[PDB]
Amino acid sequence: NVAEAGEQFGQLGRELRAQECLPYAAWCQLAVARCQQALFHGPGEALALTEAARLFLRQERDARQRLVCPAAYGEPLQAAASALGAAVRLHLELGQPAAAAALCLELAAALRDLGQPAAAAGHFQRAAQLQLPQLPLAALQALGEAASCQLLARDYTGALAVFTRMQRLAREHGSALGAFSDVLVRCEVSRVLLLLLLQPPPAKLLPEHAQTLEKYSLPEELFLLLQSLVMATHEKDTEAIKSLQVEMWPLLTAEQNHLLHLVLQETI
């Protein structure tokens, strides 16, 4: 009775995908998910909801990535947000957190891909909260992309908080073992640059920051140049930093170079 209606709506959705319109095909996928919610199914309603969300984010990609249009204003963003909220709630009723975390990771990537970083960082931290016992490497990667989001949206103290949380997690699970060494290298460069960017008072200064600024007051040339850069900034010596960046440019990535340019600007 309802399985033939679900297969009919799925055939209609595939036909509309072949026609390539894609609000209506995802609406028929919501009809599939509602008809499969009318019975007791579980994961297939989630599959219909996720495919509807894939179609909605694909249409908004076609409306802002492939077509950077001045008239578009994000309707299937809201539709995909509602559908994926229903999907992660069905996963949380089922009890499988890793799939829901993958869904929120996809939401975060599609939201960062449009020029809207704050809700992307929020959904990244939700997806990393949903993976804390199970897969800590996935939690560290979600938190690192979250840190890049909050550094895009210029919540620097949020990036400091998420970086000290990343170092706390990787120290607690890291004996470093592997890719945890890569996490520690990136976090130790960016936490030093993010401590020299906003120079905290000793009241709000957590003891972990006291440990790193005691270590400063990882590859060898980078440790030596950054230790010299902490000394040249706490000296406030301009030409020192002006000759230090030209040697420190290839040893850092792009976003760390953004942080170092922000360091060099707020001493000049």
Binding site: Q65, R66, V68, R112, D113, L114, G115, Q116, P117, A120, C149, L152, T253, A254, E255, N257, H258, H261, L262
Partner: peptide, 18 residues
């Protein structure tokens, strides 16, 4: 500008974001 120089993109991640 369609591909490389848009914020938050994957392909963007070489340009130093300022």
């Amino acid at each position: 500008l369609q591909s490389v120089l848009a914020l938050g993109h994957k392909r963007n991640s070489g340009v130093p974001a300022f």
